[PDB]
Design a protein around this nucleic acid. Structure first.
Lengths: 50, 1110, 50
RNA sequence: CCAAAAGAAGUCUUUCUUUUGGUAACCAGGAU
C-alpha cells in the first residue's frame, strides 16, 4: 500500500502481504471400470499447509 | 578452477586446455601504458622488442623536435615527458564531477645557433586524463570507454579489374601512406603504364622516371622485359629530365610559371621530405615485406625512396605480364600476387593509445606552427622557452577527443557483461574509417582470416551488422596493430606444448589442425586424416604428417559473451547472434541466482569485468557490515574495502555490492570478497532458473508471446530497482543572483510541504509527476525605469523583487522515493563550472515488478514479451502439485533451429533433481568417457558444458534415465524427458506427456512502463504550431507519409483532413473543437494549417513571389 | 505483516549501521514469516536487539 | 488554458469581479 494512500510518515515501509496458509495441494483418482458397468471414482486429496 | 574461492562447478569437458584465458582487459591497459611509457610496458617490450623501446609521447616529441627557423639561427627541442601523481582518487573524481587526470611536464631547451646560450625549462603541458585499473576514463564525472578502430594498414596494394570494352585484365597499384599524398600506377586499355600523382590526370610512367633522374637508356636497360614499358617510352614524347620536371609541375601546380629549382624541390618535398609524407613503422614494414627490400635493417625512416617506386613499377608490370615470383636487386624474391584488402593481415587495429597519440600529434603540430611563427616576431635574447610555447591548442585537442568523437563513448553499464563487451569492441566506423550509410556487403562479411581473431557471431543486428565486432578470448594485438592467436606447434607428429602467436599471414603459410582432434595421451593423433585449414581458408583432409600447428582449444573463435551460451553448436548462427546480443541487455535483479547449467566462463568474466571486490592481499576478516569489509593482513597492516550501495549506473540501474564473507573467515589474494550487481558468489548471474513447459496453452503464448506464473510476482523473482538522476544549478547571470529557496512566487503551501527549510525535498518523500524537487527563482529581468517605481527603488529603497521561478519539477511519467540528495556550493570552495554558484542533484528510485508486455529472453535467442500472468492455481502442475513457472510455445523451436534450449531444459531438470549412475556391475557404456565425480550429483547441483566440448546426447539420455525421486519415491519426468501434467483450469490431465525442465531466463531492459504514452492535448512547438514529441514533454504520435497513403487508399478523406488540420496545427480549430466536444456541439470545419503559411514565408524569404489566386 | 518501521532508516534503499544485510534484504527475509492473528484490527509487534 | 492575491454571497467551500504572472539543432545509442 502506497505510503501516501494512508496517513504515514517518512519512516513507514509498506510491505507486500501474502495471507495464504496453504502451501501445496495435489490429488489422484482411482477409477474402477469393471466389465459389468458398475463404476465409481475415489478422490485422494493431499493438502499441505505452512 | 584457478580462483582461490570459486564454487565447485563440475564440467563435462573431455579435452584439456594448455593455455589459460588471458586477462580480458589487456588490450586497453597494455595499449595505454605504452602511450604513457610505464616501466611495466618497458619490461614487457624488453622480453620481446628490446631493440627500440619508445612510448607514444616520446615518439611524438622526437618527431616534433627540433623546431628551427628558415635561417637556422635558433632551435627549440622537447624531451623527457614526465607525469605527476593524479590530482585526486577515482571515487572523489566520480563524486565531485572532476576529470581523473595527471599533470604532464616536458623539458624544453632553447638554443641560439650564433651565441650558444642554452636555456632549459620545465614546461607544463596540461593535465592528461589517465586510465583507471578497469580500462575506463573518467571525464567530467562520467565513465567513458575508447573503442578500438579497425582501419586499413598503409602500404602498397595491387588489384586487377576486368575491362568491359576489351575484356582485358587491367591491373593497378595504390600507395596509401599515413598522412601523405597518394600515387597510383595503372595499365589502361591501351598498353601503357600511367601515373596519378596526388590526384591528377594520368601521365606516362616514363615522365616520372625521368623526373627522378633516369635516362632513356637506363629505363630500357632495367625495364626491358616488357612490351608495355617500351611502348610507353617510345610514345613518351618527352626528352630530357628538365622537361619531365616541367610537365609534372604543370600537372601539379595550376597557373604558375614553371621553373627548374621549384620543380626540382617540390617533387622531392611531396614524397621524400618527411615533413609532408610519412609511412609510420607499420607502413614501412609492409612495403619492405611486400617488395622484400630491407629484410635485415631495422625500421628507422618513414619516407619513400626511388628504390621503392621503381620496385613498385616493376612489380606491377611483371604482375600484368603474368609472372609468378620476382626478385629485386639487393633483396630477396617475393611472390607476385594481388591483394585482398579485407584480409586481417591488411587490416590493423588503432587501439586506445594510438588514437590519443594522433590527437596529441595534431595538437603539437598546431603548437609548433604557433612557436615558429612567434620565433620571428620577438626580438632575440628576450626569448625564453616559456614565451614560445602556447599550450592551449594541445589541451583543446584532448578535450575535443574525450568529449566529441565516435570512438569515445559513455561506458555501457546495463549490467557487468555490457561493460566488458564494450571494452573489447572493434568498430570499423569512426574518423578515418568507413561509414554506415556507405558500406557495402563485402566489408560486412566474415572473412576466413577472422578465425581466432574476431568473433563471427557477436555483432549488431541492425544496420551496423558487420561493421562492429568483438575480440576473441585468446587474441592479442602485436606492436604494429595486428591481431594474433596462440597455436600449439606439432613437431614431427608430436603435439607439443610450445605456444606460438601467429598473425594472419603466418597462419596463412602453415597448415593448422583442429583443437577437438583425437590426441592419444602422448601428443599423437589417433588417425592420419584430420580436418585442417589450408592457405585460403580451405578445409581438407591432410594425412597427419604435414600438420604444423593446432588450436590451443575450441572456444578460441568465440568472444566472451558468446562463450556463455551452453550448447552453442546445437543452435544456428542466426539465433546465437541474438542470444549473445541480448545477454548484455539483461537488467540486474534485487536478488541474483547463478545458472544450474553454465559453461565455466561466468567466473572469469565476472572477476575480469571488475564489478566485484577482490581481496588484494591474503589475511583474516576482522569486521563485516553492509558498508565495508576490514581485512587484517598477515603483517600488521589492515585494509578497509568500502562498498557501493544503491548507486546509479550510466543506464539507470542499481549497482549494489554486498559482502559474501563472515567476520572470522580467512581470505586469499585474488579471492572474491563481495558480490556485485549481477553476480552470485563471484559468477555472472543475469537471470533466474524457472520451471518450464513446452506446450501451446490456449493461444496466450501465440506468436512468440509468453505465459508467467503469478508466483514470480508474489515472491519478487524478476523484480529490479531503477534509479533516476535530476540536476539543477544556480548561476550568476548578468542580472545576477539566482537563488535556491522556498520563497517561490505564486505557489501555495500545500505544494511546499515536502520541501525542507532551504528548498530541496526531504529524503524519503515519495513524488509524482509535476512535484517540485528543488525550489529556485531567477531575476525576472525587464529592468525598467518607470518613474515612481525607479525613484522609490533608488532613494526610498523599494526592493526589486523581480522573480521568475525556474524550479526543478519531476518530469512526466516518473515517481518513486527520494533516496539521496547531493548539494554543492561555492561557499565550501567546491570546484564548480565557471559562473555557477550552487549545484544540487536528487536521486529518485523505483522498484519495478514483472508485468504484461515486459520482455524476457533465454540464452539461445528465444525472446518474447509476456502475454499473460496467470494465477498460480490455473497452471499446468506436476503429479505432486508443483505448478510450472513459465510456458513456451512449441511452434517456435523447430523452425528457428535453436534446439539448444531443449537440451538445456533437459540438463537443467537433471541438475535440479540430482542423479546417480548405478555402477553396480561395471559403469554403463554411455558413461565410459564421462568424467569421474559426474556419476552422481546432489539435488540443485551446478554443472558446466563448455561451448564446443560439453555434454553429448547419449550422456544426456543416460542421465535422464537415472534421476533421483523428489520426496516420496516418485519420478515425475520419464526417460524421454516429458511429464504428465494436469490442467489446473479444468482439472483433467493433459492426454499426452509434455516436456518439462529448468531454463535460465533473463529480464531485458525493454519494460512497458517506459513505453506507454497517451495525449489528448498539450504543449505545442513554436515556429510551427504542431505538438511536441517525446513522453517527457508530452508530444503526439507522428502521422507520417505512409500512414497518409494508407488513408488515401482507404478513401477516407474526412479522417485525413481532420488529422492534419484540427489535430496538428489549425490554431483556431483546436480550441473550437475542444469547446464543441465539452459543450456537446458539432465539431466545426477545419481551416488552414500554420505550416503552409510558414512555408509561404520561407519561400518569400528566398526571393520568390509566391501568391495565392482566386 | 503489512508494514515495518526501522528507527534509523527513512526508506527501503538504505543500510543499518552494524547489520550485515541492508534494509532490502531484511525485508525479503521478513517476507518469509508465518504468523497467525486472532483480531480484525491491525496490531503491532516489536523487535529489539543489541 | 493554469497559478497566486484581494473583495462579495452561500456552503462550511463552491460561484462572480479586479490585478500580476505565465523552444530548437547537432552527435550518439537502441527497437521492430
Amino acid at each position: 500500500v502506497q505510503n501516501r494512500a494512508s496517513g504515514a510518515e517518512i519512516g513507514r515501509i509498506p510491505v507486500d502481504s501474502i495471507y495464504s496458509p496453504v502451501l501445496k495441494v495435489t490429488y489422484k483418482v482411482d477409477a474402477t471400470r469393471v466389465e459389468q458397468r458398475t463404476d465409481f471414482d475415489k478422490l485422494i486429496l493431499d493438502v499441505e499447509t505452512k | 578452477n584457478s580462483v582461490p574461492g570459486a564454487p565447485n562447478r563440475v564440467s563435462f569437458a573431455k579435452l584439456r586446455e594448455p593455455l589459460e584465458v588471458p586477462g580480458l582487459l589487456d588490450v586497453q591497459t597494455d595499449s595505454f601504458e605504452w602511450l604513457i611509457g610505464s616501466p611495466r610496458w618497458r619490461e614487457s617490450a624488453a622480453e620481446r622488442g628490446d631493440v627500440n623501446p619508445v612510448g607514444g609521447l616520446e615518439e611524438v616529441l622526437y618527431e616534433l623536435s627540433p623546431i628551427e627557423d628558415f635561417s637556422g639561427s635558433m632551435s627549440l627541442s622537447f624531451s623527457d615527458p614526465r607525469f605527476d601523481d593524479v590530482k585526486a582518487p577515482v571515487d572523489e573524481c566520480k563524486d565531485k564531477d572532476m576529470t581523473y587526470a595527471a599533470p604532464l611536464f616536458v623539458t624544453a631547451e632553447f638554443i641560439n645557433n650564433n651565441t650558444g646560450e642554452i636555456k632549459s625549462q620545465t614546461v607544463f603541458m596540461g593535465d592528461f586524463p589517465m586510465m583507471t585499473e578497469k580500462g575506463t576514463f573518467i571525464i567530467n564525472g562520467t565513465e567513458r570507454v575508447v573503442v578500438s578502430q579497425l582501419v586499413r594498414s598503409p602500404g602498397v596494394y595491387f588489384d586487377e579489374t576486368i575491362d568491359k570494352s576489351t575484356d582485358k585484365t587491367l591491373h593497378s597499384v595504390k600507395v596509401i601512406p599515413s598522412r601523405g599524398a597518394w600515387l597510383e600506377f595503372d595499365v589502361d586499355k591501351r598498353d601503357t603504364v600511367g601515373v596519378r600523382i596526388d590526384r591528377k590526370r594520368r601521365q606516362p610512367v616514363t615522365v616520372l622516371l625521368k623526373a627522378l633522374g633516369w635516362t632513356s637508356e637506363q629505363i630500357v636497360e632495367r625495364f626491358g622485359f616488357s612490351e608495355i614499358m617500351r611502348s610507353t617510352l617510345e610514345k613518351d614524347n618527352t626528352v630530357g629530365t628538365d622537361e619531365a620536371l616541367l610537365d609534372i609541375y604543370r600537372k601539379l601546380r595550376p597557373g604558375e610559371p614553371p621553373t627548374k629549382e621549384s620543380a626540382q624541390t617540390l617533387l622531392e618535398n611531396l614524397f621524400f621530405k618527411e615533413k609532408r609524407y610519412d609511412l609510420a613503422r607499420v607502413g614501412r614494414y609492409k612495403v619492405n615485406k611486400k617488395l622484400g627490400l630491407h629484410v635485415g635493417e631495422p625500421i628507422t625512416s618513414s619516407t619513400l625512396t626511388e628504390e621503392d617506386v621503381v620496385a613498385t613499377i616493376e612489380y606491377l608490370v611483371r604482375l600484368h605480364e603474368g609472372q609468378t615470383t620476382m626478385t629485386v636487386p639487393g633483396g630477396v624474391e617475393v611472390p607476385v600476387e594481388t591483394d585482398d584488402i579485407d584480409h586481417f593481415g591488411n587490416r590493423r587495429l588503432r587501439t586506445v593509445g594510438e588514437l590519443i597519440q594522433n590527437q596529441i600529434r595534431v595538437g603539437m603540430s598546431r603548437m609548433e606552427r604557433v612557436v615558429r611563427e612567434r620565433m620571428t616576431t620577438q626580438d632575440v635574447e628576450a626569448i625564453t622557452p616559456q614565451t614560445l610555447i602556447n599550450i592551449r591548442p594541445v589541451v583543446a585537442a584532448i578535450k575535443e577527443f574525450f568529449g566529441t568523437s565516435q570512438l569515445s563513448q559513455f561506458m555501457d553499464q546495463n549490467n557487468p557483461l555490457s561493460g566488458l563487451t564494450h571494452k573489447r569492441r572493434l568498430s570499423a566506423l569512426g574518423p578515418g574509417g568507413l561509414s554506415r550509410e556507405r558500406a557495402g556487403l563485402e566489408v560486412r562479411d566474415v572473412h576466413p582470416s577472422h578465425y581466432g581473431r574476431m568473433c563471427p557471431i557477436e555483432t549488431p543486428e541492425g544496420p551496423n551488422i558487420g561493421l562492429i565486432g568483438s575480440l576473441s578470448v585468446y587474441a592479442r594485438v602485436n606492436p604494429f596493430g595486428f591481431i594474433e592467436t596462440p597455436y600449439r606447434k606439432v613437431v614431427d607428429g608430436v603435439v607439443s606444448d610450445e605456444i606460438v602467436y601467429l598473425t594472419a599471414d603466418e597462419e596463412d603459410r602453415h597448415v593448422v589442425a583442429q583443437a577437438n582432434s583425437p590426441i592419444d595421451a602422448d601428443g599423437r593423433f589417433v588417425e592420419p586424416r584430420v580436418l585442417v585449414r589450408r592457405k585460403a581458408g580451405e578445409v581438407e583432409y591432410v594425412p597427419s604428417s604435414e600438420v604444423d600447428y593446432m588450436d590451443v582449444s575450441p572456444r578460441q573463435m568465440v568472444s566472451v559473451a558468446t562463450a556463455m551460451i551452453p550448447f552453442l553448436e546445437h543452435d544456428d548462427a542466426n539465433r546465437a547472434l541474438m542470444g549473445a546480443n541480448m545477454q548484455r541487455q539483461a537488467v540486474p535483479l534485487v536478488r541474483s541466482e547463478a545458472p544450474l547449467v553454465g559453461t565455466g566462463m561466468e567466473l572469469r568474466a565476472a572477476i575480469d569485468a571488475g564489478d566485484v571486490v577482490v581481496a588484494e592481499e591474503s589475511g583474516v576478516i576482522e569486521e563485516v557490515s553492509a558498508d565495508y569489509i576490514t581485512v587484517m593482513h598477515d603483517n600488521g597492516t589492515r585494509r578497509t574495502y568500502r562498498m557501493r550501495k544503491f548507486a546509479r549506473s550510466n543506464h539507470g540501474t542499481c549497482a549494489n555490492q554486498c559482502p559474501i564473507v563472515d567476520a572470522g573467515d580467512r581470505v586469499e589474494a585474488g579471492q572474491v570478497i563481495a558480490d556485485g550487481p549481477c553476480t552470485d558468489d563471484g559468477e555472472m548471474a543475469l537471470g533466474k532458473n524457472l520451471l518450464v513447459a513446452i506446450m501451446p496453452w490456449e493461444g496466450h503464448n501465440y506468436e512468440d508471446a509468453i505465459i508467467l506464473s503469478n508466483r514470480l510476482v508474489e515472491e519478487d523473482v524478476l523484480t529490479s530497482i531503477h534509479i533516476e538522476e535530476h540536476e539543477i544549478d544556480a548561476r550568476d547571470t548578468k542580472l545576477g543572483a539566482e537563488e535556491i529557496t522556498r520563497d517561490i512566487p505564486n505557489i501555495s503551501d500545500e505544494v511546499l510541504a515536502d520541501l525542507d527549510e532551504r528548498g530541496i525535498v526531504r529524503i524519503g518523500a515519495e513524488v509524482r509527476d509535476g512535484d517540485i524537487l528543488v525550489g529556485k527563482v531567477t531575476p525576472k529581468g525587464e529592468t525598467e525605469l518607470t518613474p515612481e517605481e525607479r525613484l522609490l527603488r533608488a532613494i526610498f529603497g523599494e526592493k526589486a523583487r523581480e522573480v521568475r521561478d525556474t524550479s526543478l519539477k519531476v518530469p512526466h511519467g516518473e515517481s518513486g522515493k527520494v533516496i539521496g540528495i547531493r548539494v554543492f556550493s561555492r561557499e565550501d570552495e567546491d570546484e564548480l563550472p565557471a559562473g555557477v554558484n550552487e549545484l544540487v542533484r536528487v536521486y529518485v528510485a523505483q522498484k519495478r515488478k514483472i508485468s504484461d508486455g515486459d520482455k524476457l529472453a533465454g540464452r539461445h535467442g528465444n525472446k518474447g514479451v509476456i502475454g499473460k500472468i496467470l494465477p498460480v492455481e490455473d497452471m499446468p502442475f506436476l503429479a505432486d502439485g508443483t505448478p510450472v513457472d513459465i510456458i513456451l510455445n512449441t511452434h517456435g523451436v523447430p523452425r528457428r533451429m535453436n534446439i539448444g534450449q531443449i537440451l538445456e531444459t533437459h540438463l537443467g531438470w537433471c541438475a535440479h533433481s540430482g542423479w546417480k549412475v548405478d555402477a553396480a556391475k561395471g559403469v554403463p557404456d554411455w558413461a565410459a568417457r564421462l568424467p569421474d565425480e559426474l556419476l552422481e550429483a546432489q539435488p540443485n547441483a551446478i554443472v558446466s558444458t563448455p561451448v564446443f566440448d560439453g555434454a553429448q546426447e547419449a550422456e544426456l539420455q543416460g542421465l535422464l534415465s537415472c534421476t533421483l525421486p523428489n520426496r516420496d519415491g516418485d519420478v515425475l519426468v520419464d526417460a524421454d524427458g516429458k511429464a504428465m501434467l494436469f490442467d489446473g483450469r479444468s482439472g483433467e490431465p493433459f492426454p499426452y506427456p509434455v516436456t518439462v525442465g529448468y531454463m535460465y531466463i533473463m529480464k531485458l531492459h525493454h519494460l512497458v512502463d517506459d513505453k506507454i504514452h497517451a495525449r489528448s492535448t498539450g504543449p505545442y512547438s513554436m515556429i510551427t504550431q504542431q505538438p511536441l514529441g517525446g513522453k517527457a514533454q508530452f508530444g503526439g504520435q507522428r502521422f507520417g507519409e505512409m500512414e497518409c497513403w494508407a488513408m488515401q487508399a482507404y478513401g477516407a478523406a474526412y479522417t485525413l483532413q481532420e488529422l492534419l488540420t484540427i489535430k496538428s496545427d489549425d490554431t483556431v480549430g483546436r480550441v473550437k473543437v475542444y469547446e464543441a466536444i465539452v459543450k456537446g456541439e458539432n465539431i466545426p470545419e477545419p481551416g488552414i494549417p500554420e505550416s503552409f503559411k510558414v512555408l509561404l514565408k520561407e519561400l518569400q524569404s528566398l526571393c520568390l513571389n509566391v501568391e495565392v489566386l482566386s | 505483516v503489512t508494514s515495518i518501521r526501522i528507527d534509523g532508516v527513512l526508506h527501503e534503499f538504505t543500510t543499518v549501521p552494524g547489520v550485515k544485510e541492508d534494509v532490502t534484504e531484511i525485508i525479503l527475509n521478513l517476507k518469509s514469516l508465518v504468523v497467525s492473528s486472532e483480531e480484525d484490527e491491525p496490531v503491532t509487534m516489536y523487535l529489539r536487539k543489541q
